[PDB]
Scaffold this active site. Sequence first.
Site, PDB file in Angstrom:
ATOM      1  N   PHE B  54       0.824  -1.185   0.000  1.00 44.37           N
ATOM      2  CA  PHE B  54       0.000   0.000   0.000  1.00 44.37           C
ATOM      3  C   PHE B  54       0.868   1.248   0.000  1.00 44.37           C
ATOM      4  O   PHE B  54       0.480   2.278  -0.554  1.00 44.37           O
ATOM      5  CB  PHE B  54      -0.920  -0.029   1.209  1.00 44.37           C
ATOM      6  CG  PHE B  54      -1.841   1.137   1.289  1.00 44.37           C
ATOM      7  CD1 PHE B  54      -1.538   2.221   2.108  1.00 44.37           C
ATOM      8  CD2 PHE B  54      -3.023   1.156   0.557  1.00 44.37           C
ATOM      9  CE1 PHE B  54      -2.396   3.306   2.200  1.00 44.37           C
ATOM     10  CE2 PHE B  54      -3.891   2.242   0.640  1.00 44.37           C
ATOM     11  CZ  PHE B  54      -3.578   3.319   1.465  1.00 44.37           C
ATOM     12  N   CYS B 163     -17.663   9.470 -10.449  1.00 44.62           N
ATOM     13  CA  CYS B 163     -16.596  10.433 -10.635  1.00 44.62           C
ATOM     14  C   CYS B 163     -16.792  11.351 -11.837  1.00 44.62           C
ATOM     15  O   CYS B 163     -16.141  12.393 -11.921  1.00 44.62           O
ATOM     16  CB  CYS B 163     -15.259   9.702 -10.767  1.00 44.62           C
ATOM     17  SG  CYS B 163     -14.618   9.032  -9.227  1.00 44.62           S
ATOM     18  N   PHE B 214      -8.944   8.341  -3.081  1.00 43.85           N
ATOM     19  CA  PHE B 214     -10.044   9.203  -2.684  1.00 43.85           C
ATOM     20  C   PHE B 214      -9.880  10.079  -1.443  1.00 43.85           C
ATOM     21  O   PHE B 214      -9.383   9.652  -0.405  1.00 43.85           O
ATOM     22  CB  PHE B 214     -11.320   8.376  -2.546  1.00 43.85           C
ATOM     23  CG  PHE B 214     -11.606   7.504  -3.732  1.00 43.85           C
ATOM     24  CD1 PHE B 214     -11.585   8.024  -5.021  1.00 43.85           C
ATOM     25  CD2 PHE B 214     -11.906   6.160  -3.559  1.00 43.85           C
ATOM     26  CE1 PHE B 214     -11.861   7.214  -6.127  1.00 43.85           C
ATOM     27  CE2 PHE B 214     -12.184   5.338  -4.656  1.00 43.85           C
ATOM     28  CZ  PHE B 214     -12.161   5.867  -5.942  1.00 43.85           C
ATOM     29  N   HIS B 302     -10.793  15.179 -15.283  1.00 45.61           N
ATOM     30  CA  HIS B 302     -10.964  14.587 -13.963  1.00 45.61           C
ATOM     31  C   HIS B 302      -9.686  13.834 -13.562  1.00 45.61           C
ATOM     32  O   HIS B 302      -9.151  13.016 -14.323  1.00 45.61           O
ATOM     33  CB  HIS B 302     -12.176  13.646 -13.952  1.00 45.61           C
ATOM     34  CG  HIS B 302     -12.311  12.851 -12.692  1.00 45.61           C
ATOM     35  ND1 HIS B 302     -12.503  13.432 -11.458  1.00 45.61           N
ATOM     36  CD2 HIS B 302     -12.272  11.513 -12.474  1.00 45.61           C
ATOM     37  CE1 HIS B 302     -12.577  12.490 -10.534  1.00 45.61           C
ATOM     38  NE2 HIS B 302     -12.439  11.317 -11.127  1.00 45.61           N
ATOM     39  N   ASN B 335      -8.439  12.432  -5.306  1.00 44.51           N
ATOM     40  CA  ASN B 335      -9.673  12.276  -6.060  1.00 44.51           C
ATOM     41  C   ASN B 335     -10.885  12.614  -5.186  1.00 44.51           C
ATOM     42  O   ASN B 335     -11.339  11.788  -4.402  1.00 44.51           O
ATOM     43  CB  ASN B 335      -9.811  10.844  -6.577  1.00 44.51           C
ATOM     44  CG  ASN B 335     -10.846  10.722  -7.693  1.00 44.51           C
ATOM     45  OD1 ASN B 335     -11.814  11.488  -7.753  1.00 44.51           O
ATOM     46  ND2 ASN B 335     -10.648   9.747  -8.578  1.00 44.51           N
TER      47      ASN B 335
END
Lengths: 389, 389
Positions: B54, B163, B214, B302, B335
């Site tokens: 991660f 999104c 996010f 985006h 995001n």
Amino acid sequence: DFEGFRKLQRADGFASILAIGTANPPNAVDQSTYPDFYFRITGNEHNTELKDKFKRICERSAIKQRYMYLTEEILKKNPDVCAFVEVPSLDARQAMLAMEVPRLAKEAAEKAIQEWGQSKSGITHLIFCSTTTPDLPGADFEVAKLLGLHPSVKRVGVFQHGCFAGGTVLRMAKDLAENNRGARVLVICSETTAVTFRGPSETHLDSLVGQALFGDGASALIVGADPIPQVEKACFEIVWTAQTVVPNSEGAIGGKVREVGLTFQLKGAVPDLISANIENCMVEAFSQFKISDWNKLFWVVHPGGRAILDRVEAKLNLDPTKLIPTRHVMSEYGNMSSACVHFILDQTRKASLQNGCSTTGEGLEMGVLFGFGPGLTIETVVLKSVPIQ
Amino acid sequence: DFEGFRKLQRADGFASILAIGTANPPNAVDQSTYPDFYFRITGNEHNTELKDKFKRICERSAIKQRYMYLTEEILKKNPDVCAFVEVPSLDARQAMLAMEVPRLAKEAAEKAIQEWGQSKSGITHLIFCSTTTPDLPGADFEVAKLLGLHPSVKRVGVFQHGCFAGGTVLRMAKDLAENNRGARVLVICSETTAVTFRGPSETHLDSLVGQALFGDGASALIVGADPIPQVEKACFEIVWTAQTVVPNSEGAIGGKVREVGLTFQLKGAVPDLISANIENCMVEAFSQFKISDWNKLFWVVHPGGRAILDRVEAKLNLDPTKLIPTRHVMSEYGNMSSACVHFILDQTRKASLQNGCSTTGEGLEMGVLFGFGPGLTIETVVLKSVPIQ
């Protein structure tokens, strides 16, 4: 050329209804029998007290029938759906929804499309309405897929607004059609009690109200401005629209999407609250057309319940002929939420035809359409019938 | 009669952005310490492999910081939100959502309202967007209520679109502001990870990514046609709009609202699907403006993820300057789903100002805006800049 890009881009006349399609699930439920079935499938026959409260309710709902996706088969296999709230059941409802909602919608488009008579390839916009949608993408994407709509169709999903969405959908259709020359908007409302059906609870009598009035259904309209002569037949024109929040009505109608599925909350005040504000709406919408006699317009009211209809009919003292198509629908289809009003719109143009009326609005040239829901919200829509040759 | 009612009911000019406001939750989280923290707060410190995995995802994200509603104190009082999917957490999240989303949306818009410097009463429309909404009525009603908006504001909620919604709302705002003379639409996009934050899992790496990408934020716009001279200052105009579904791209982006909250699937093929089709969208939205050189336009895409931007740029061969505004916001916020492109619009106009450019579009006249989400759909918006003098 830029100020020129605008005029050419927009449409001319009023966004008009060029077709209306309808569909419901196969299981027709007789209201006179629902009380015994409802309390038996949920395993509550032991509570004779409640049953009578519910029976009284169904017997006074003015609903003789309702189409329900949920059948005894599905219910016996989904005991979690039969419970009140002692166990979660969202995921099971969600699955029912992802399959049923789009299926009912397509069936309605297919009829609307056919009546419209043009190639589905010509549909430029898609407005999809449902009390809820289970995933991402919403049901609007799923229905477009199933119908085979062109990949460049501009979609707008209208979820979790409420029983008034039937009107907001027309308000949105109107602006989409009139600001885009040559545009044809596919407007669909699809509802099922799959997300709201649950067991009874004496301490939640309001929820019990919803179990007797909510029914399943889907409607489909094709809206567009500047209909093709001899080709596209308009039956209604969307003239003006308005939305408002009734004062001191907070909490009147609400719902919650939770682990036990969707919860329905409805206050006994709704009828009063709608009656005490419905007239303001009328003067705000019709005075501009110099119209003061409500009985000179045709009526299309969301059948949120028998009491609400009787109130509006009194506070406005519309003659007995006004709510006939609206009550016709409520009686045969129950409260199909957002879809209701469109079912009435079809019922209205149908009666007009079968009765030799001068226009699609039962002889009258102008009419109003109402939407009632969480807000409490009031959605108004002014129509213009079309003459029938 | 009606051919006049129509002409007066609609606006003359181009739908225009008259103000942009932005809001974010207190908690500023640094992507650098998120790996240790994320695995700590979730009781997953021991699984050094997934953690290092991660850390590696976070280090490629190109996101330097994000604003999160969920603080450590909040996650500590809510262990279930920390699990992955072994225990339900929808209810707890809905509660977080019911309060945080409208709160953030309210802050963004007060900022927006202020810049616009006009009365709130003048707001005749409201377009509210959020990945989800917990109840009925949705966050549109609530935001109006916190805002003290007029009871008759025409509101619309856009939920579970994705999104790409940042653009569908502009697509919706354009039609509303242009078909209603005098209309001023308040456009709000509020998003929070509270409904999506969950523990890590080695069998769901697509979900890992999402925990690192996010972030939270709210954007607010005032859209209206025919801006009042020296009273209202426009910065961007919405000329032409479009949305499309890239062929054979189902499941690439999606989400399911379940008893464990909003789960999220994200196939790795996303960057390629968007890239091998975005070119097609540009020749559809610009040939009509005799434009073929993409680099002659400013950009608002985006910020789905570094890769999507890296592929898009290489594909269309854009100058490293096009995505300075996009990559800059993704770097400071991450995001924020639908509200990102609005953050970018704002940052883009601010940059044009500080540097001394001829227009709000860093010197260029026309620009493009993109939104990518579940569909997979792409929202394309051709924007017109305004001079700075």
